Every structure is written in structure tokens, then in C-alpha cells.
Amino acid sequence: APKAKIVLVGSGMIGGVMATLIVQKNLGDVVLFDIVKNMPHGKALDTSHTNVMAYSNCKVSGSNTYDDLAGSDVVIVTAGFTKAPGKSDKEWNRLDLLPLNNKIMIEIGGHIKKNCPNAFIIVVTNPVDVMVQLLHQHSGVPKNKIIGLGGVLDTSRLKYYISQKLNVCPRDVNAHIVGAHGNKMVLLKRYITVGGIPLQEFINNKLISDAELEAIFDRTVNTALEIVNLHASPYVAPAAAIIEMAESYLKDLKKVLICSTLLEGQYGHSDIFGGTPVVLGANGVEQVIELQLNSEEKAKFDEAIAETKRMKALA
Amino acid sequence: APKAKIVLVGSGMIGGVMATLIVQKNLGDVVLFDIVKNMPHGKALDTSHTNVMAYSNCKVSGSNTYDDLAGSDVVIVTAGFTKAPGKSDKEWNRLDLLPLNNKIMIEIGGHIKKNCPNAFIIVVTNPVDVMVQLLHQHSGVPKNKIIGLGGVLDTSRLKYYISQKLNVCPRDVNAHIVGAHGNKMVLLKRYITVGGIPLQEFINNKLISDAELEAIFDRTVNTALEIVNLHASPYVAPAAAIIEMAESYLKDLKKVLICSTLLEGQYGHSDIFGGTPVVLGANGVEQVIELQLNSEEKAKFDEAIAETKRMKALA
Amino acid sequence: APKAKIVLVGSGMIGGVMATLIVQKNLGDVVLFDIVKNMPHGKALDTSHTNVMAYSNCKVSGSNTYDDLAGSDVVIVTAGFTKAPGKSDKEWNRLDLLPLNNKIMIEIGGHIKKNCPNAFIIVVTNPVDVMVQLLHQHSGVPKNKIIGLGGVLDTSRLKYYISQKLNVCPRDVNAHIVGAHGNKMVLLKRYITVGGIPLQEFINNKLISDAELEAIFDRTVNTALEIVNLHASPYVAPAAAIIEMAESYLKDLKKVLICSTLLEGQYGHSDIFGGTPVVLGANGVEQVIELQLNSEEKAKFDEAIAETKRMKALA
Amino acid sequence: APKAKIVLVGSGMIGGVMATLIVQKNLGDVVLFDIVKNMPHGKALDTSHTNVMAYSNCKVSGSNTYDDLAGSDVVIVTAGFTKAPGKSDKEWNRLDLLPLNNKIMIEIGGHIKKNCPNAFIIVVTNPVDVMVQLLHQHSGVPKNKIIGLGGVLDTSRLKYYISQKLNVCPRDVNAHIVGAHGNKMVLLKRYITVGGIPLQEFINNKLISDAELEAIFDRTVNTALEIVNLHASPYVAPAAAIIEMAESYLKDLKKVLICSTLLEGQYGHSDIFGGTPVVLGANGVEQVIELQLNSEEKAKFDEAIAETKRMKALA
Ligand SMILES: NC(=O)C1=CN([C@@H]2O[C@H](COP(=O)(O)OP(=O)(O)OC[C@H]3O[C@@H](n4cnc5c(N)ncnc54)[C@H](O)[C@@H]3O)[C@@H](O)[C@H]2O)C=CC1
Ligand SMILES: NC(=O)C1=CN([C@@H]2O[C@H](COP(=O)(O)OP(=O)(O)OC[C@H]3O[C@@H](n4cnc5c(N)ncnc54)[C@H](O)[C@@H]3O)[C@@H](O)[C@H]2O)C=CC1
Ligand SMILES: NC(=O)C1=CN([C@@H]2O[C@H](COP(=O)(O)OP(=O)(O)OC[C@H]3O[C@@H](n4cnc5c(N)ncnc54)[C@H](O)[C@@H]3O)[C@@H](O)[C@H]2O)C=CC1
Ligand SMILES: NC(=O)C1=CN([C@@H]2O[C@H](COP(=O)(O)OP(=O)(O)OC[C@H]3O[C@@H](n4cnc5c(N)ncnc54)[C@H](O)[C@@H]3O)[C@@H](O)[C@H]2O)C=CC1
Secondary structure, eight states, X not given: OOSOEEXXXXXXXXXXXXXXXXXXTXXXXXXXXXXXXXXXXXXXXXXXXXXXXXXXXOOEEEESOGGGGTTOSEEEEOOSOSSOTTOOGGGOOGGGGHHHHHHHHHHHHHHHHHHOTTSEEEEOSSSHHHHHHHHHHHHOOOGGGEEEOOHHHHHHHHHHHHHHHHTSOGGGXXXXXXXXXXXXXXXXXXXXXETTEEHHHHHHTTSSOHHHHHHHHHHHHHHHHHHHHHTSSOOHHHHHHHHHHHHHHHXXXXXXXXXXXXXXXXXXXXXXXXXXXXXXXXXXXXXXXXXXOOHHHHHHHHHHHHHHHHHHTTO | OOSOEEEXXXXXXXXXXXXXXXXXXXXXXXXXXXXXXXXXXHXXXXXXXXXHHHTOXXXXXXXXXXXXXXXXXXXXXXXXXXXXXXXXXXXXXXGGGHHHHHHHHHHHHHHHHHHOTTSXXXXXXXXXXXXXXXXXXXXXXXXXXXXXXXXXXXHHHHHHHHHHHHTSOGGGEEOOEEBOSSTTOEXXXXXXXXXXXXXXXXHHTTSSOHHHHHHHXXXXXXXXXXXXXXXXXXXXXXXXXXXXXXXXXXXXXXXXXXXXXXXXXXXXXXXXXEEEEEEEETTEXXXXXXXXXXXXXXXXXXXXXXXXXXXXXXX | OOXXXXXXXXXXXXXXXXXXXXXXXXOOEEEEEOSSSSHHHHHHHHHHTHHHHHTOOOOEEXXXXXXXXXXXXXXXXXXXXXXXXXXXXXXXXXXXXXXXXXXXXXXXXXXXXXXXXXXXXXXXXXXXXXXXXHHHHHHOOOGGGEEEOOHHHHHHHHHHHHHHHHTSOGGGEEOOEEBOSSTTOEXXXXXXXXXXXXXXXXXXXTSSOHHHHHHHHHHHHHHHHHHHHHXXXXXXXXXXXXXXXXXXXXXXXXXXXXXXXXXXXXXXXXXXXXXXEEEEETTEXXXXXXXXXXXXXXXXXXXHHHHHXXXXXXX | OOSOEEEEEOOSHHHHHHHHHHHHTTOOEEEEEOSSSSHHHHHHHHHHTHHHHHTOOXXXXXXXXXXXXXXXXXXXXXXXXXXXXXXXXXXXXXXXXHHHHHHHHHHHHXXXXXXXXXSEEEEOSSSHHHHHHHHHHHHXXXXXXXXXXXXHHHHHHHHHHHHHHHTSOGGGEEOOEEBOSSTTOEEOGGGOEETTEEHHHHHXXXXXXXXXXXXXXXXXXXXXXXHHHHTSSOOHHHHHHHHHXXXXXXXXXXXXXXXXXXXXXXXXXXXXXXXXXXXXXXXXXXXXXXXXXXXXXXXXXXXXXXXXXHHHTTO
């Protein structure tokens, strides 16, 4: 069948929500692959029944066999750790996931190269900007066929917090967070709009203040940590963000979505992956949009990339 | 039942598409009211069967009785003429619909006042900015409970044409057209974004030129005329625009949508209706957003309002 | 792009609603082909703008060129007449459309054979059971790649009328109408269920009577005539039925839908098309389900096929 | 705002998926209430961001305060244990949850009575048929305003397994499981249809055998145990089933759905809750449908009710 085959490499919390959303949207057949025995089968069985409630027809299978990557149209990688086994939630940091997740990406890359070299790849494993390039290199896929999750999620948080202060539909607030997904993420105040109107107009009208926005910015950057300390490493929004990206690709929607992508000169950077708006369609990353950042914004972008480069040196 | 009752006053081309979309979206029960005998019943019967295909449960009834407005939660007025009975399609102009549709609005207003004074009203009949105020005055409804169709439709055309040149998802282009729905509509080049990014960046990158944009602007303004000369007064997009507005109201989405609304000082105008972004939610027009227009843009806005004022004088 | 290309051969009332629904559902690119100059372009332009309201990305183009069938994944044929130019609405009969639509099918078949021999074809033009076979023969497509509209529409009417008497969700009533789409359609009382429960149980409980059901049966058979006399040849429900079929094919849903399909022994008939439940998926007509009809029901089926055979003899 | 307020009493695995699906479908505002400190806030925060990806506008709040039940339109109770703290997964049984969950229902009932006596209640906590009546009595709500989850979930499993053997859309298989949700659930072979066609026809055609169906029946009954031993107490399908019920109520769909409801003579039983098809609409349980079971099926139903009665005696 010409229905898309979507392989979720990693069947944990995010993997579970992704499978659920894929069935709700009838996006394609799903394989919940994981290193843990039987669990993926259990989740798959549970999720497969929703086809009835959703009026869909998507097969949902579990797997503990890498070769099931064969024939994959889309591969979503969440495989790895959410935190370092010994740190407290208070000291939670994506950087500490570097020595834990690196070897996993190499292993997965080799299987992708052998089994589904023409698949569209979405990397989620943290530190994402480092992990995505590691997988790009080991999988051998073209630069337009691999992206990392970052901006769609970070901006969803920023967009949401602003929409609640202004009392407008969440999707009506558009915003851009670039550079890298982590504590050095670059929140672009200048590029925020509400109903397509520059945010500064709402600031001028005393509808939202600069002080409130600064607090919203800090909350956005610290959201993962805030949720990690309240409950666990976030998974619902991450899953929804990923599926919006996967959906744009599968349905050729050509949505402008901020993702980690290979930079080849944009922002003065090359040979590294960084967050920037891209257009996702049938041909993968169809366009890499370079925001005409001012020097102050570019300095922040450089600081974000510097972090990715530091961890890429695996130190 | 607490399901919303939506009365479509006018069951012509736009009325037909609206009923179809309401059932697709399961928005509420529908009454296709019209002055023409039996036709509304025929359309209603045809449309009611789609409940099966759509997995919905919306009653769709025809009516030739004004009293069926009783209990209406939303009233959409398309009643009237699409053109003046004697003009050629080449000389098609919304202004000529003034002497034809004025009496119709007064009649409908009286029935709304008597039967459903608490309903949310959406006026479509042209010249819309004039007709909406006429209905506002005769229906007695509060200013936050009545709007006219204009900007959502005009901008859909502008957004679409730009999305095809740039190869991005149509919804990713945001744009604003204000003042009035007609030949004096104000297309705000300064307020156009793509994926939330200022359009000027795409112009700077030679992705779209100023000359191409100027051609797109003219096409947008002349779209109705272009379609009227190819086929008929547009109805599919108008219907979709109206339902997006009605849906924002019914589901309390709080979308920022450009509609004709009573101006009370915005842009230096009062006691007149004009197109401007508003927030539509459960309380109707919850916010009227005034774009901080520059003098050049304001001069264009004044020219648009001048036209509405001229026809309002019924001359 | 791998997005499906859907060619609507005939851009009239049904064609218009189909294009609208395809965009709402983001099913694929649409070509509104017609013999009438410019009209398809006008409708296409109008419909294309809805991509904005619908958050979709489907191209909608008009055409007056048969070669645009090239590359078509799905071809929906509505081309032809809705009534005979001289009969009154009171004497409206699908049989009189035979001498009007036959030549049209042959012409379209030749173009399909040359331009898109691997496309999935849905024939709507009346008398449908005759027209579908005529197109099958002239297009050269495999038997599993062509079907005619009939049962999904006829049953939607029967299902709907019963759901309103019993006060249940319309989709919860399942029913089967077979043989042919026309005055000899076979309404199978024995195969009606409500929430999967045999209808006879509701009849036993005095929730609906046999007399009421008999009236509902007559209304179902005469629905097209009833609407034709109130308004025009039905188009909204027909369009929704067609899209449900096209959607089952495109998304590999494998829905059991009653359509006109080539009979090869089922019900004792061969070399003729007749209405019967089929399973529509990625491989087209994946299964032809033969209802184990009793002799009384089979006698009615024979009467329906007899009519198709009579008109097939073009008399 | 007139948007529905949905209180999820219990914010565990099922609660999490429900909140996610409510936002996807824009069903209403959500309160994730739980006894565990901070966790509901974390899940709510995570889920609230999806409003962006889903184009919805549903508030999602966490709570550790019972009074937040005030103003609730729908209350979904999942509060309790999934297993007895000391049993192995191999010996997992819903009956052992009786001494653990009883006190919880009484406590919740008192709060519902005081805070939202007019809310529609959906009980999920196991053993569900016992728990729902316990909550009915302590909450004081009318019999038409409270139901327990059971049949929609059990049948989703049966419907699914059959659809995969027959290669048809999962929703096209309709089936009925009654009496109680547990090991004594009554699978009604006689009431199974495929595309509305009696299953026996497919058995006659050698498309599926009686032996295969018997294996599918056993798998359906043991599904929860199978998943519990592979992964954990199922939550994705349960959540989807619950939301389909809640949605039928909120949108007045009037779907026929099998749920645990107060029996007042049906099947020869009174003063006890049992699984049976009901019609869920704006007025709650609008109809209780009694299947005209034969003596053999009724004997099985009696065995199911006997179990509920035994545990109701809290022994
Ligand atoms: N890029 C972004 O914006 C975000 C990144 N993340 C990251 O996503 C990753 C996953 O998050 P969760 O799903 O919450 O974690 P989780 O721990 O729930 O799931 C990860 C799964 O990966 C599995 N795994 C380990 N090695 C495997 C391998 N070789 N192949 C397949 N599966 C394997 C584990 O058994 C586990 O089931 C983490 O690194 C997390 O930090 C989380 C949110 C957002
Ligand atoms: N505001 C905007 O953005 C747009 C405005 N329009 C306007 O919408 C109006 C309707 O357009 P269509 O649906 O294409 O026209 P149409 O001619 O197809 O339908 C109008 C219907 O109103 C009926 N009618 C007349 N008096 C009536 C009354 N007293 N009460 C109820 N029904 C009555 C007519 O019988 C007719 O069926 C026109 O004035 C058109 O110019 C069209 C597109 C966009
Ligand atoms: N099978 C079924 O269940 C149903 C069948 N019908 C039939 O569908 C057909 C179409 O119905 P409507 O859309 O309401 O009619 P319509 O008259 O609105 O549209 C038919 C279109 O076909 C065009 N046409 C004629 N020759 C053409 C050709 N060579 N190629 C392409 N286009 C050409 C006409 O110009 C016209 O625009 C009719 O025969 C009608 O009887 C209608 C409802 C249900
Ligand atoms: N009726 C049916 O068809 C099905 C029933 N179930 C039942 O649903 C229940 C919940 O299942 P899961 O969500 O997987 O369990 P879970 O353990 O993940 O979640 C239950 C939550 O209830 C909380 N809780 C305890 N007392 C509370 C109170 N007084 N008020 C509010 N929250 C409180 C717990 O802290 C926990 O977070 C279980 O009894 C399970 O057996 C599960 C599937 C289907």
C-alpha cells in the first residue's frame, strides 16, 4: 500500500503521543521501535484500537528489530535519555545528555543508511542540534532530508503565553526562536506578531508591557525545566510539534516551521546545524529561510551555535 | 438542544456553500431562509443527507417564514442582488447594488429585532460596509454583536497569490486589507508577513519583487470582477470566509479576523463601519484592533471610508 | 509532488461541490475540466482561495483541454445532462439522459485511455450503471479501477430519514440499496441496522413502524425527483458521497461502500455493472461483496439489472 | 465563556491522553485534577502548548483542589488504582481494585453533589460497573447524567481484530459486548456486522471462520491482561473511547454507544448498572436500548451482572 510508513525509533513518552496523533490524523502506518522488550508491542496494541474511535485505518506495530526500518518513509528519532542518571531535577540540563545519546545516534544512523536511505528523518534526541548532525553524518542522507525538532516547540510556548495575556487564538501569535534548542535559544522580540500585526503595536497600546514580555521570554526558555520539576521531561507538546513537521512533509503543505537544519553560510555559519525557519514539503527541506538579523540578534545566534559547537567537540 | 441554531437569511449560492460547510464542521442546526418558494427546502434536503458522509448531526431546514429567526444564535445575511439588472459583467460594480439591497436590510432588521435580538449577526450583502450599518441600526443589536464580511475574504486572495509565488503554505502568508470591501480597499504592503517574517525580507532576497507584488495587489482588488467575468459573483471563498468568522464566534476561538465593524474613534473615524482586524469570540467582537497606520496608509483608509459614507447617503 | 492529482471531468454543480470538499479535506490537487469556456477557471479561482480558510495546500485549476487528464490519479466523471431538454420536472427520469450522455462517455473514455490509463475512475453521469460500463469499455481500465456512484448516495437518504425518526446519529443507521441507481433501486429492509442492531428490534418495540418504513422507502426512491421539483437535480449529497469514495481510495481506508461495479457471477449476473457493497482501498475495488440475498430480494435485483440491460441496448 | 468545562478527576495515564485529545478536538476547557501535588500542573502546562499545533483554544489547568469541580459541564473519573499493590501482572484482575477504589468514589461523589450536581458524569475507575453505581448514589445525579466506560472500549478491540482479518476499515465492523466490563463480558456473535452485513455471510464465504472468531473473542476478553503483561494497564484506547462518549454528549451527536447505565427492567434486571447500547446526546442518556437477547445470550448477561452484584456487596 502507498500509505506512508512512519518508524518511531524510540517508543517512550514522546513516541507514545506521536503514535496516538498519527492515528487521530490517519497519517500512515506506524512502527513503535524500541530497545525495551515487549513494551512497544503493548503500546502499539493499545494505540491500534483507536482506529475505531478515530475512523482511521493505520496499522500500529511494535518492534525490537532494527531491520523494520526497511521501507520507512519517515523516521522519527527520540531514542535516548531525558536526563543524566544522577543529577537532580533542579540541575536538569540538556547538555548532560551528550555522553549518553551520542553512541545511540551512530548506531541508528548505520541502520538508516542500510535500510531506508531515502527516508525523511526527524531527530528529537537531546542535545538536538548536536544529535541531528551526528545522525546526518552517520546516516548518509541528503541535507534536505533531515531536520531536528526545536523551534516549533519553543515558539509554541512563547506564542501560547502571549496569546493568554492578549486573549487571542494561540495560533494567531507568530514568533521566532532560533540558533539552538537549549538555554541559549534566541528569542526574537522584533519578529513577534499578533494576527499578523507587529507586537510593538500592542506594547504601544499598553495591552502588554515590555516587562511582561521579558518574564514570558524567561518562562519560555525555562519551560522544560519548569515542567521537569513539576512532573517530567515534556512529551505532549514535543509530540504535537513533531507531528506538525512530519505532516507538513507527508501532505506537501509547505509550512514555514523553525527546525534545526544544516547551515551553509546563513548567519555566517557553515558545517553546523542550527534552528531557523524552513519550508517543509514533499521534497523535504525545500527552502532554508535566513532571517535578516541585526548585529545584536546575530551576536545571540553566534552564542547559541557556539554551544552546539562546544558539545559537538564531545566535551 | 443547546446546539447552536444558525439562520442563513438568503439561500442562494453563498447560502448553499455555507450550509454545506456548517454540516461538514458540525457547527449547528441550519435554516436556509429565502423569499423564493420551495428552493430553500430543496437545498436543505440535499444538504441534510451529507450528515451521513460527514459523521455529523446537524438539522438542515428550508424556510420561507421570517419567524423562523426566533431562537437564532447566529444570523448570516446574504439576502439581495449580486449585480444590477441591466449592467454588463464588464461594468460590474458593488456600488450599483445599493438601491437594490437597502430595503431588504431594513426588512430583515425589523425581524431580527423582534425574533432574535440577542443573536450574533454577520452581514454579507453588498455594498457590505453600508449594508452592515443599515442592519445594525434597524435590528437594534449591540455593536459587539454585528459584523460585515470583507477582510477575511479580500486577504485570502492576497495571501493565496503571494503563497503561490513563494511556494509556501497559503495560511503562512498573513496580510491586512482595511477600510472597506470594494474598489477602495486598502492593501497594507507594510503589514504582510510570510511564516511571520516581514515580506520585505523576501523582496530583499529577490524571491518576490515589488513589481510582482503590485500586480498581485491589482489582481486582489479586481478578483471579484475577474471571476464575475469568467463565471459569476464569487461564492465558495466568500462562504468559507463567513464560516471561519461564525466558527470563531461559536467555538470561542478568539481569532484575529478583519471584518467591518462600528468605528468609535479608530483611524479618526466614528459613527461608521469599516474594515479592521477584530477578535471574534464567545462575546462577539471582543476587541477592535486599530492598526497604527502611517499618514499615507491613513489617507487611503480615509478614501475607503469616504466611499461608504457617500453610498450611506443613498446617492 | 506526490500529492494526488484529481481531475473532475465536468465542472457543473456536483463538480463545484467536489472541488470545495477536496480543498476542505486537503485531498490533492484539483482540475476542474469542462467543455464550457472560462467557467471552470472562474470556479477554480474562487475555490483556490479557500485553501487559506481550510489550512490546506491544494492547487485548483480550471481546464478546457482534455490533455490535462495526463498524470491524473483519480478521474471523476459528471460530464453530461441532468435532464432531457424538453421534459417537465414532473416527468423527470434518469433514463431520458441515455441518448444525451452516451457519446460523452465514449469521448471521455478515449482520452482517459490515452492520457491516464492507470487512474482510478468514478463515473457519476446518468443513467449511471449504463454509463459506467460504457466508460469502462472505452477507457480500457481494469475492472478494479472503475466504479459508478449510486448506493452511497441512495443509502445516505435512507439512513438519514430513519435516523430522524429514531433520534440517533445519522451515521449510526446502516442500510443497503443495490442493483441499480434509479427507480428500480433495491431497498433491502432485512439489511438495515441502528447502532449495529437489527432494525426489526426497533420495529418490535414500536419505535418505528413498518408503515413508516414503507413511506421512508418511497421517499428514498423519489428523493431526486422530490428535490428536482423543489429546486434542481441534487448536487451537495452526490458530491459528498463521491468524495467519501474517492477518499477511501486515496487514503486506503478500505471502507465498505455500495457502488456500481462489474459483476462476474454475483447475484447470477455477469458482463454488466450493478450496485453492490465493495471495499475501496489503495488497490481500487479490493473486494466485491455479494449479499446472500433471498429469492424475493434477488427477484428485485434482477428487475434492477434488467433496466440497465434495456438501456445498455441504447433503446 | 459558554465553552464546556471538562474536569478530569484523576490525571494519570488515561487523564493525560484525554486532555491531549480534548485539545486536538477543541472540545472545551480542561482541568486535570489529582491528589498528587504539582504533577497535574506539569501535564497541563505541557498539553496547553498543543493549542498552537492544533489551531485550538482550550485552557488546560492542573488542580489539587476539589472545589475546581464547580461549574463543570462534564466530569470524567479515572481516580484510583490500576492494579492491587502486591499482585503480579500475570494475576492481574479488575476485581482486586474493589477495596482500593470504593472510598475514592464516595469522596468524589460528595464533591460532585456539592460543586456540580448538574454535570454529566463518566466513570472509568475499575471495577467500573460497581464504581459507577457507587458514584451515582453518592453524587445524587439523575440516572440519565451518569455512565461508565466499558462497551465502546471492549468492542473497539473486537471490531479491530475482525477488520484486520477481513481487510476492511476498522469502523466498518460493528459489534456488541454487554453486561459488564471484565472477564464476564458478553460478546454477542449474533450482533456482529461488516459494512452493515451480518458477519455470518463472511463466515459462510470462508472469509473468516468460526474457529478464528472464537480466538478473536478470547483475545478481546484478555486484551487488558495481554497489554498489562506486555507494558501497562491500557490507556490510549480507553482515553479515545471516553472522549468519543464525552464528544457525543457535548456535540449532541446522539451516537449509539455501549456504556454501563442504570438498568430498570431491561434484561430482567433492576437497581444495578450494566453495559448496554445507549444514545448519548445533549440530554445525557437519551435512550437505553435493550437488545432482544435470546435465552443463551441472556444467561451470559445474568452471569456478568452476577459478578457486579457480588462485588457491589463489597466482598
Ligand atoms: N528536540 C526537542 O525539542 C526535544 C527533545 N527531547 C528529547 O527527546 C528524547 C526522548 O524523550 P522522551 O520520549 O520523553 O524519553 P523516554 O525516555 O520516554 O523515551 C526514550 C526511549 O528511547 C529508548 N531507546 C534507547 N535506545 C534506543 C535505541 N537504540 N533505539 C530505539 N530506542 C531506544 C528508551 O528505551 C526509551 O523508551 C530525549 O533525549 C529528550 O531529551 C524532548 C522534548 C523536546
Ligand atoms: N461582503 C463580501 O465580502 C461579499 C458580498 N457578496 C454579496 O453577498 C450577496 C449574496 O451573494 P450570492 O449568494 O452569490 O447571491 P444569490 O443571488 O445567489 O443569493 C441571494 C439570495 O437572496 C435572496 N433574497 C432576496 N431577498 C431576500 C430576503 N428578503 N430575505 C431572504 N432572502 C432573500 C434571493 O432570492 C437569493 O436567493 C450579494 O449582495 C453579493 O454582492 C458576495 C461575496 C462577498
Ligand atoms: N450517479 C448518481 O448517483 C448521480 C448522478 N447524477 C448525474 O451527474 C451528472 C452531472 O450532474 P450535475 O453536476 O448536477 O450537472 P451539471 O449540468 O451542473 O454539470 C455537468 C457539466 O458537464 C459538462 N460537460 C458536458 N460535456 C462535457 C464533456 N465532454 N467533458 C466535460 N464536461 C462536459 C457541462 O458543461 C456541465 O458543466 C448528470 O448526468 C446527473 O444526472 C447526479 C446525482 C447523482
Ligand atoms: N472502565 C474501563 O473500560 C477502563 C477502566 N480503567 C481504570 O481507570 C482507572 C485509571 O486508569 P489509569 O489512568 O491508567 O491509572 P493511573 O494510576 O495512571 O491514574 C489514576 C490517577 O488517579 C489518581 N487519584 C487517586 N485518588 C484520587 C482522587 N481522590 N482524586 C483524583 N485523583 C486521584 C492517582 O494519583 C493517579 O494519578 C483505573 O481504575 C483503571 O483500572 C482503565 C481502562 C479502562
